[PDB]
Amino acid sequence: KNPKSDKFKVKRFHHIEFWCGDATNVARRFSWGLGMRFSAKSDLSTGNMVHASYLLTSGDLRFLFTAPYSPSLSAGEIKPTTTASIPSFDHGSCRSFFSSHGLGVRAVAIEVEDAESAFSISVANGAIPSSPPIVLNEAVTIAEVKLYGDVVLRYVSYKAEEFLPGFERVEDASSFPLDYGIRRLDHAVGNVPELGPALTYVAGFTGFHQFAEFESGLNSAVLASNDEMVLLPINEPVHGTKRKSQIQTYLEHNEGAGLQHLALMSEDIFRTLREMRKRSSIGGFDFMPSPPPTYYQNLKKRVGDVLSDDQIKECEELGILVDRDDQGTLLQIFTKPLGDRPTIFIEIIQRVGCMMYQSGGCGGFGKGNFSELFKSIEEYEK
């Protein structure tokens, strides 16, 4: 059931912004590790005396990395005279965020029809304002409201139809055309202490509806836009369990609520994982430990009608997990944490089924893999 109750017109995920201490080193690491191209910049070389911001792209996926310069470079400026290309940026906020949480996502940005309208309607419906709508070069409007923790939901709307005004396209020489097959952001997941109030708040100001699914440490629910292409799952810990909840570990090391993982859709998850795994120990990303061979033996019964034996063997080579709901099949895998703290990580996913284009959330989010992994673990021990 989809009541299509969005309180304003939402289009797609637009970009994800990391707040960094040094944007250069994180962006270069991510670029090599994920196969994303350097495509735009806003920094000292473009006249920005406030923050360094670097944009990586892969297909429609946009990762933005931002860090503050010394406030002294911009001490003479006021907001009317700012050289920052992202007017919501604040030195104090950024330094406080990174010292509190370490490396992580500050903004989940979605493209909307009218960012000013989205902001007003959101705040009229309970959203906590973070940055009011601001029109950039009469061309783009940006506004921000609180999502959870110190993460903001950023609205962006374009007059037209180049990232943001004041950003410059990156020279071909510095722009190497890496591509490991990642194409878009599928969903972005938050961890909170209490799921109920988080859901009530966000669904309250967006109109996003609960996306239907079908003890492992969590309870979760997924909020979705009208066409279910913007997908925002939220987790809370389950306490008292045998193994300590990974959601609770997140909350402790992150100093509270925040974004837990980003799921990146690949047009060819086997190629993506071959390319990422080649680079794990030479600057890229590590992956969680692979499931036992029992897991892959059990894949024949569960998805033998969707994947060939070879395709299943290819999953085993790369440590890919498989889940299935009543509509489609999901291939997925999780990286180890992206930085020092056991907080944010990345998921790579590919979905098969639900053709009309492919409908959002086809195959679910892999909740069946909690129990299937436990099963296959015990089976393998025997």
**CB of 14 closer than 8 Å to CB of 34:** no
Residue 144 or 325 with smaller CB distance to Co ion: 325
32 binds its own copies (CB under 8 A): yes
232 binds Co ion (CB under 5 A): no
Least Å distance, CB 382 to its own copies, is: 27
344 binds Co ion (CB under 5 A): no
Residue 13 or 250 with smaller CB distance to its own copies: 250
Pairing between β-strand 345-353 and β-strand 258-266 as defined by DSSP bridges: parallel
Under DSSP, is residue 62 helix (H, G, I), strand (E, B) or coil? strand
CA atoms within 13 Å, Cβ hemisphere of 206 = 30
263 binds Co ion (CB under 5 A): yes
314-318 long-range contacts, Cβ below 8 Å, gap at least 24?
Answer: 314/270, 316/290, 318/270, 318/273, 318/274, 318/277
Number of residues that bind Co ion (CB under 5 A): 3
The answer to whether 187 is annotated as binding is: yes
114 binds its own copies (CB under 8 A): no
CA distances from 189 to 233, 235, 260 (A): 5, 8, 5
Residues 319-358 touching its own copies, rule: CB under 8 A, are 338-342
Q: Work out what residue 40 binds among its own copies, Co ion, ligand O76, none; the CB cut-off runs from 5 to 8 Å by kind.
A: none
Pairing between β-strand 61-68 and β-strand 10-19 as defined by DSSP bridges: parallel
Residues 41-80 touching its own copies, rule: CB under 8 A, are 43-44, 52, 67, 69-70, 72-73
Quote the CA–CA distance of 248 and 230 in Å, as a whole number: 26
Interface positions with ligand O76 (CB under 6 A): 187, 189, 220, 222, 233, 246, 261, 263, 288, 334, 347, 365-367, 369-370, 373
Which range in 21-29, 266-274, 339-347, 350-358 contacts Co ion by CB under 5 A? 339-347
100 binds its own copies (CB under 8 A): yes
Residues 224-263 touching its own copies, rule: CB under 8 A, are 252-255
Sheet strand arrangement including 182-191:
209-211, 218-224, 231-237, 182-191, 258-266, 345-353, 328-334, 321-324
Binding-site annotation: residue ranges for Fe cation = 187, 261, 347
Residues that bind Co ion (CB under 5 A): 263, 347, 365
Q: Which residues are annotated as a binding site?
A: 187, 261, 347
